[PDB]
């Protein structure tokens, strides 16, 4: 079968609940994290630090 | 709970706290609570109790050596437009500061702050916290015993405070406290 044979092939799922809790909050942190340092960056801003 | 795990920072020849000798530790607690702070900027919570709990953590870090102890955040969190439960927090930090640095211009923002706010439950809240934590008690010799504090807060009890019954008892409660029953002693 690979002379005739002709079955379908699919990629692989990623069906784990550890990694896809993972994924979920690693890309909720990322995308608040850029969405916080872009609007404290274009607005007025406060530091904790001297000149931070 | 982050800000219960901060302990005194291993401060050597009062070395000004800057952001490179900062701990390992108070980094990821100090990029999470920057983190809640401005997302509560842009997503408010029910009655501001991240900003609340985020005003508390940087006191908290400010009062052991990592964060510099300057009351400008605070200052800026106390004005008039904000929620009063934020006001109440940031006027918290502003006297437990006044306290820890004995700090004259930041006591005179306060009793400035208690003879005119518009808000009077937030004028009673401020002579409540500076009655509960004093900037000096009466054992104390302090750099802020003069006779002119002893001047404003007789000037306060006297006068000032007497459109409210509830501000008068507390300026009262505030001479009792730093003074004591007798006469004040750092007087002539």
């Not at chain 1, 909050?25 to 607005?43: H, I, N, P, W, Y």
């Not at chain 2, 102890?69 to 006044?98: M, N, Q, W």
Request: charged share 25%.
């Amino acid at each position: 079968p690979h002379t005739y044979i002709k079955t379908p092939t699919y990629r692989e799922p990623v069906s784990d609940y550890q990694v896809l809790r993972e994924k979920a909050a690693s890309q909720r942190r990322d995308v608040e994290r850029a969405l916080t340092r872009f609007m404290a960056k274009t607005g007025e801003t406060q530091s904790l630090f001297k000149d931070d | 709970a982050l800000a219960n795990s901060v302990t005194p920072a291993v401060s050597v020849n009062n070395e000004v706290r800057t952001l490179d000798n900062l701990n390992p530790d108070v980094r990821l607690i100090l990029e999470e609570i920057t983190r809640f702070l401005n997302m509560e900027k842009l997503l408010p919570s029910y009655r501001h109790t991240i900003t609340v709990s985020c005003l508390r953590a940087i006191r908290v870090l400010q009062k052991n050596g990592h964060v510099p102890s300057d009351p400008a955040l605070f200052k800026s969190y106390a004005e008039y437009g904000h929620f009063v439960d934020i006001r109440i927090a940031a006027l918290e930090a502003v006297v437990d500061y006044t306290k820890v640095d004995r700090s004259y211009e930041e006591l005179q923002w306060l009793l400035n702050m208690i003879q005119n706010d518009p808000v009077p439950y937030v004028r009673h809240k401020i002579l409540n916290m500076l009655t509960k934590n004093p900037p000096f008690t009466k054992n104390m010799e302090s750099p802020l015993c003069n006779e002119a504090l002893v001047d404003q807060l007789w000037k306060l009890m006297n006068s000032g405070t007497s459109h409210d019954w509830r501000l008068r008892c507390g300026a009262v409660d505030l001479y009792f406290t730093l003074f004591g029953l007798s006469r004040p002693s750092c007087l002539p």
